[PDB]
Amino acid sequence: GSSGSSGRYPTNNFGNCTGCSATFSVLKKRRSCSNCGNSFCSRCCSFKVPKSSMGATAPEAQRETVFVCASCNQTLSKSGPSSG
Ligand SMILES: [Zn+2]
Ligand SMILES: [Zn+2]
Question: Which strand (E) or helix (H) includes residue 47?
Fold first, then answer.
């Protein structure tokens, strides 16, 4: 018997960052992750990571660097579960 099911609305927080929940003021710009594709501040989406080893490998993007959110950058860096 193993438990691990979330029973919450199918929607996710909005209007603010999905990491530090820091509203995007006139100064802050709502950025967009490259991996997960979620909204983040200018402090969470400040992580550079390769796309070649993100999900789809191609002879085009090899030495490229994309911006991702900490939450992801951390998951991508270390290995473990099936990227999804
Ligand atoms: Zn943030
Ligand atoms: Zn992300």
Answer: strand 47-49
